Amino acid sequence: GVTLMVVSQRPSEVSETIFSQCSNFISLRLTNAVDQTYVKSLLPDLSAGLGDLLPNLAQGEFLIVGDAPLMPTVGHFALPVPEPHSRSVNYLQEWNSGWRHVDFDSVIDRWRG
C-alpha cells in the first residue's frame, strides 16, 4: 500500500533502479540528446514521431507514456489555483526602474544565522 512519485530535473541524475520499475512517464520539455534518447526509446513504433516535438514543447505541455492511457498523447495543463511560490524574476522590466536601496543589515544578519 505504499507508493512513490519522484520528480527530477534530468533522468540520468537518478538511480537506475528506481526509474527501471516506474511504469508511466510524464515527459515535459527536454533539450539535450542523451535525455531525449531515453524518452524516445520507451515509445512504441506505430506512433513514434511524437518525440520530434519534445525540443520545442511549450510552457505546460506534456507527453504521456505507459499503461494508464488508452494511447500516448500530448496535453496542456491549466495553472493551479493557488500556486506554489516558484515565480520567475522579470529581468528587463526590473532593469528599467531606478536604482534600489538594500538594507544590508537585514540580509547580513539573516545570513549570520
Partner 1 sequence: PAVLEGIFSHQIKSPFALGTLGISPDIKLKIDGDRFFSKHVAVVGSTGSGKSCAVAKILQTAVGIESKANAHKAAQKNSHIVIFDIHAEYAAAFNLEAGEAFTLNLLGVDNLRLPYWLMNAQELEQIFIESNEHNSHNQISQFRHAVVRNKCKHNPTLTNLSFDTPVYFSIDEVVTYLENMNNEVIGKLAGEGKPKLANETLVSDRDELYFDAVQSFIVASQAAATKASNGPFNGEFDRMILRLHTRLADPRLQFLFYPKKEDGEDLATGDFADVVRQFVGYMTKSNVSIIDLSGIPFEVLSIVVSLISRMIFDFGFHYSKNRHVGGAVSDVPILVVCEEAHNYLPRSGGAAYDASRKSIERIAKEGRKYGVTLMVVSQRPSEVSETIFSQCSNFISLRLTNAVDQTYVKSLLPDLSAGLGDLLPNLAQGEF
Shortest Cβ 40–partner 1 spacing (Å):
10
Does 20 engage in binding with ligand AGS (CB under 6 A)?
no
Shortest Cβ 2–partner 1 spacing (Å):
10
Which helix H or strand E contains 64, and what residues bound it? strand 62-65
Does 37 engage in binding with partner 1 (CB under 8 A)?
no
Does 90 engage in binding with partner 1 (CB under 8 A)?
yes
Residue 36: burial class (beta carbons within 10 Å; 0-12, 13-18, 19+)? middle
Does 94 engage in binding with partner 1 (CB under 8 A)?
yes
Nearest to 28 by CA among 63, 56, 52: 63
